[PDB]
Design a binder for this molecule. Structure first.
Ligand code: Q2A
Length: 208
């Protein structure tokens, strides 16, 4: 049972801007996703101070980067706090509406796409390099879901039938045909070193 949803017009507008604007420095997507993973790892660590039981779904706090040339995917995996169905359908968009407006205001005033993370919507920078994004996520006290969107104004949510994760989020980037450089070990290493070098969690780059 797959549910189909329309993005708020403001989010659809943001995604179109990311897809349509000529902007050569696409590699910033990876910093934005790693930063989101780090923040989600922080969140579950903090929650666990008052309530140790929230690590019952996994004590290890880390990030994996998994390239796959057969599937033409780059997956960013974390064991952070995860997202609920209510998040995927309602709450993320509610919060992202404000950040999107500020970001577009800043772009008018002369900012560039590389500062998107200051507005809380760096996730959508995935669409610089991906034709489709699939998000697998599991939050304590909710089920594992698959969110998916190829932009175009809509997204889908299903209960995920795949391998159970425990707790956390997988962002699966289905890369555009001309963006397969982000599957190459040397390129990913370069980018993580340049932009994500002080992240306070292990980042494991899987080999093909
Ligand atoms: N890896 C990750 N792990 C966990 N979470 C991640 C994440 N990546 C992202 S970004 C992302 C990923 C997406 C997306 C949109 C975005 I925008 O659509 C499909 O998938 N988020 C979502 C976070 C990013 C920081 C701002 N919050 C606000 C918030 C909302 C609701 C509830 C709370 S609360 O419980 O603390 F009150 C807070 C959401």
């Amino acid at each position: 049972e797959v549910e189909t949803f329309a993005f708020q017009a403001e989010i659809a507008q943001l995604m179109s801007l990311i897809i349509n604007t000529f902007y050569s420095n696409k590699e910033i997507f990876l910093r934005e996703l790693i930063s989101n993973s780090s923040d989600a790892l922080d969140r579950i660590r903090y929650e666990s101070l008052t309530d140790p039981s929230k690590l019952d779904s996994g004590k290890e706090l880390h990030i994996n980067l998994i390239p796959n040339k057969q599937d033409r995917t780059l997956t960013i995996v974390d064991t952070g706090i995860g997202m609920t169905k209510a998040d995927l359908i309602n709450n993320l968009g509610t919060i992202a509406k404000s950040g999107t407006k500020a970001f577009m205001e800043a772009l008018q005033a002369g900012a560039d796409i590389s500062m998107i993370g200051q507005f809380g919507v760096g996730f959508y920078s995935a669409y610089l390099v991906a034709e489709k994004v699939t998000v697998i996520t599991k939050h304590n006290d909710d089920e594992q879901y698959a969110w998916e969107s190829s932009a175009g104004g809509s997204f889908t949510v299903r209960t995920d039938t795949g391998e159970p994760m425990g707790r956390g989020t997988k962002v699966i980037l289905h890369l555009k045909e001309d963006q397969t450089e982000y599957l190459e070990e040397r390129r990913i290493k370069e980018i993580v070193k340049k932009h994500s070098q002080f992240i306070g969690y292990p980042i494991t780059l899987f080999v093909e």
